[model samples]
Target chain A: ISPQLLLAMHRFLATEVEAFSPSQMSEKILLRLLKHPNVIQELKYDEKNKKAPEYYLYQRNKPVDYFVLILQGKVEVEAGKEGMKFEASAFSYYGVMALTASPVIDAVTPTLGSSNNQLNSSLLQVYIPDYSVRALSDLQFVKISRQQYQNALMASRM
Target chain B: VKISPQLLLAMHRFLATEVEAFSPSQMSEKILLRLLKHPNVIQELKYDEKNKKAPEYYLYQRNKPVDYFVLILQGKVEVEAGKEGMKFEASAFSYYGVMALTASPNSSLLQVYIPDYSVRALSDLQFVKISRQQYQNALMASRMD
Candidate 1:
């Protein structure tokens, strides 16, 4: 099981920024979710760059590019008027609710031959994120691309 | 979902035929399992009423939209791929829709997939049916938690 992904999920859910929590989901199940296809992790920051990459995992009323899973440190989730915090220190998970509840991301045109000649990119839809999460500390996280995240969700049977 | 042993048997049996590329772990457990449980997700491959004594018939014709997913509840089924015929027994639950599942919902993209071959029931067919939409919702909604 991807421990970082699991930890990130736990932290995100802990804040209630997303609806479901790691506790609400069994570890076996959450582990499966992290292992699901297209759920990749690409947030290993530069080793020499000791900068805090506390960027918003998702911005309010905008498209969310990635589903952030906390690795270490804390995150502040601001959905609207009020803001709350959560920690995925161990076995928690988050972002599903924020993503599902988030708005649909509009499809964009890609470069020619860039779409594999199947025209799949033009038909794609994305979530227009409804909230934002600020890195409150030296936060580390891994991310799943928006398209993969949607397909992962769309393709699931259970 | 409370599925019968028959359904479970059919599911795994059919899937065993395509175990190589159709891994269930790729999809979320919550959505995948729920879709498997919905009764509407299973469909009869027969033309007449599924409960009548009418002559047994196949669900969809060759090259037709396998628009509906099929699983043999208590009978054996023959999937005709070209001139070759591969037969298997379906007990309770089985995933005959690996082709369907392989098509993978682009809830992120804009595409879909259908079945690979035509299926004929060898005897009185009692099967679970799956609709694209039923599983579609199951795939997308349950995660709302």
Candidate 2:
């Protein structure tokens, strides 16, 4: 991955995440993400629909296993069940909090209790998508998987 | 920015006198030194070089948010809060903005906030400023054990 490309992306993530929801840990979080081996490639946008470029990024009642970073256009984000709707534009990141919420729990601890398994069966990961996302324009964005994010986190500490 | 011996000494004094009140637990001198030397903080330091003979002064108005932590290296400062009798004088090595900057963490780093008091230089002041982001970054880097 090119440092120039990655650094540019890192800068955008820094500003976008701060604008979305200010956090002290954001710079740390994004810097950790940069340690991923294939961060640049993983984040690169691949057009899925040629005829109709505008499409659903994700739908309500679906799973979102990755974080999306908007680079070029507008996105319509709706959590109708939660009574939340917003239009997100360039330099915005979606589903970041959920993706990086609890990496240590997923694969770190070896002792998996039977009771915990039962609880997990009923519950779900924080990354589960609660909102439907769609492109309001011909959009360009990047993404990183939940596993990739956790890998990045562990990689930095190592 | 160039690191100066004077700036380093002022940092030591500021941390010794001020940061202890905001820190959750005692910080070892070694740990404190590492934080003081961090590049993030070093890069953000802005120096006020007004000579003692200069007539210039700096005023931090009451009820406004202080965006930077300041360390007085020379001269006097008048400290005033909102209350009628709450006024005092601060001299060399005294600091402000610790309450907001250190009140909350590496993870507990607080948002930008206003102070209840104001400070104005009573003489040509010599000082250094440390911004919140830089301080947060330095503290976080120091704690990455």
Candidate 3:
């Protein structure tokens, strides 16, 4: 609702590195993390593009810290030796897979379009580093700065 | 390792002593160790005393001193060894695979199975047991912390 909260959420969703089908406990933890005021500050829906990306690519300028929560739709991640392996499903989370000064991301929507292509008010929040930008996809997401994430994590830990 | 009743009793006692009730974060490690110590708690499939031919699932155990191990608490598992095989029915507890701890450490791959009806482990089917410290460190290294 708040602009700051919407931005943080955009960053989080934008920089989701991998697709994770979370276990029950992980889901609970994720929901709890989202409740942080800093995290709440960065929640937004993808309005730039009316549809989800058929494919997307990203190369990080610096080591980025972020997480992604699937509000609606399923995404697949490809990494490791084999390219484009299905990593996880919707309503899941993926942590930062690579922390290099520069990290590359290669993502694609399945031949079957994402379950949901239009962005509406869904509570799903994606977290991303402030400096990062979209390399691929018609994604509706939130953005959060590194300091904000750190503050949120600290607050959650307390 | 072949697990005996004595071992099972010991494990039960250990769980009571070392594990915290409903503490999701702390119980996994102890549960994993207990399972590793008693891999054979699950009963193997065999023919009846009548000596009539009956179906049996395959099960095998490979010790992997790694950072993680999965525990299949309930359900039958098919274990294949080249051509020969057997089925291992679920017990209240059982250990299946291992986790890689370090580079050049030990076995990296570990496998197991869970079969459907007719032969099944009574209740809980698939679960995992892993080293808490190792898991925490891995998460921290991955920046999930």
The numbered model that scores best in DockQ is 1
Chain A TM-scores of each predicted structure, in the order given, are 0.44, 0.57, 0.34
lDDT tens digits by residue: candidate 1, A38-124: 453334333355334435555564433455666566655666545444433322234453344333344232222223432432222
Write down the worst ten-residue block by lDDT for model 1 chain A. A107-116
Report every candidate's CA lDDT: 0.47, 0.55, 0.34
Output the number of the TM-score-best candidate: 2
User: What are the per-model DockQ values?
Assistant: 0.03, 0.01, 0.01
TM-score of chain B of 2: 0.61
Candidate 2 retains true contacts at a fraction of 0.00
Which structure among the candidates has the greatest lDDT? 2
> How does residue A61 of candidate 1 score in lDDT?
46
Overall local distance difference test of candidate 2? 0.55
**Reproduced native contacts, each prediction:** 0.04, 0.00, 0.00
Give per-residue CA lDDT, model 3, range A1-158, as digits (tens): 45565444444443443221132113334444455554432222354652343233221222224444443344445544335345343334433331111211231211111223313211111222222223222233333333444444444444
Cα lDDT for residue A42, candidate 1:
32
